[PDB]
């Protein structure tokens, strides 16, 4: 049906922290909750019955298939055919007892890189009739917790369970750099909008930035809880960080101030910016998918799921959101403007 906006309100949940600081609730500008490219609501349109907890989700480009990472395998679902209740293929990646933790498409959509609770990352050719393993990257760290691909498609970064960030030349499957610094597992990763900086979160309560050309750590932010997720605003300036403590913090990159956002009751497991950068989502162990205005975090929508929300992805045109669940499924939403 047609839906209409209906305004709600909460005790103040979004705070601006200054250099002092000095936390003041944010006075939302007129285009905080409504405007061009700002979602009106989101509607659930599919449920993908993976049958194991879904630690990683990715949507194809063009949007057509969804990849869900569970135990042992990635399942491929054709969401363009409405009636399908089962995957159209399955990518068997690691020990059946071990979880896939991250999967990423190359910018051009023809290859998927999969990492998880094993020392090998598999690289999958998606053109070949039935999908097949093209190559493997064999780390000496026991697990990968998060992957990122460079925008030029040449490199894959792997967040290792030892805290190291591995940088892999995809052409010849060689480790070309290793970023050392995190003293506990690196849990999350993104790349700056100009492609030159890497940003990582860790179970050592830090966010680190790394110069990709020079190879060195640039910045370190220390927090009072573990970092589980992060995302760099595609239009720059802002880094969103989701915490074990339930806070989302939006850091002003190379600046003194930040926002602290309080609409989760538990760990912020994952986060993703829309491609337009004007809003982002966070998912919680408290079962919530939250949509937020960039940078100051006005609440655009909330969707409560049946179980913890481990993972998420947003389609290239910002039309769909997919989340992965502790209830052993993924959920496809249409974003309604």
């Amino acid at each position: 049906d047609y839906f209409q906006g209906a305004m709600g309100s909460k005790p103040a949940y979004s705070f601006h922290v200054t250099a002092d600081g000095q936390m003041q609730p944010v006075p939302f500008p007129p285009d905080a909750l409504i405007g061009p490219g700002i979602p009106r609501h989101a509607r659930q349109i599919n449920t993908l019955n993976h049958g194991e907890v879904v630690c990683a989700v990715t949507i194809s480009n063009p949007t057509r298939h969804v990849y869900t990472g569970g135990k042992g395998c990635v399942k491929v679902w054709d969401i363009s055919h409405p009636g399908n209740k089962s995957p159209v293929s399955q990518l068997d990646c690691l020990n059946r007892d071990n979880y896939i933790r991250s999967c990423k498409l190359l910018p051009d959509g023809c290859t998927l890189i999969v990492g998880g609770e094993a020392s090998t990352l598999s690289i999958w050719d998606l053109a070949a009739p039935t999908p097949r393993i093209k190559a493997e990257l064999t780390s000496s760290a026991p697990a990968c917790y998060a992957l990122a691909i460079s925008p030029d498609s040449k490199v894959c970064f792997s967040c290792c369970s030892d805290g190291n960030i591995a940088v892999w030349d995809l052409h010849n499957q060689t480790l070309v750099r290793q970023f050392q610094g995190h003293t506990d597992g690196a849990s999350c990763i993104d790349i700056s909008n100009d492609g030159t900086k890497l940003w990582t979160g860790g179970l050592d309560n830090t966010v680190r930035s790394w110069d990709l050309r020079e190879g060195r750590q640039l910045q370190q932010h220390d927090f009072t809880s573990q970092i589980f997720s992060l995302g760099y605003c595609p239009t720059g300036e802002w880094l969103a960080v989701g915490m074990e403590s339930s806070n989302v913090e939006v850091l002003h990159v190379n600046k003194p101030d930040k926002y602290q956002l309080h609409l989760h009751e538990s760990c912020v497991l994952s986060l993703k910016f829309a491609y337009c950068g004007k809003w982002f989502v966070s998912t919680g162990k408290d079962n919530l998918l939250n949509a937020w205005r960039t940078p100051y975090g006005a609440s655009i929508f909330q969707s409560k799921e049946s179980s913890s929300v481990l993972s998420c992805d947003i389609s290239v045109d910002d039309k769909y959101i997919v989340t992965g669940s502790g209830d052993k499924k993924a959920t496809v939403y249409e974003v309604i403007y």
Partner: peptide, 5 residues
């Protein structure tokens, strides 16, 4: 293995 969920 670290698993946050």
């Amino acid at each position: 293995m670290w698993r946050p969920w």
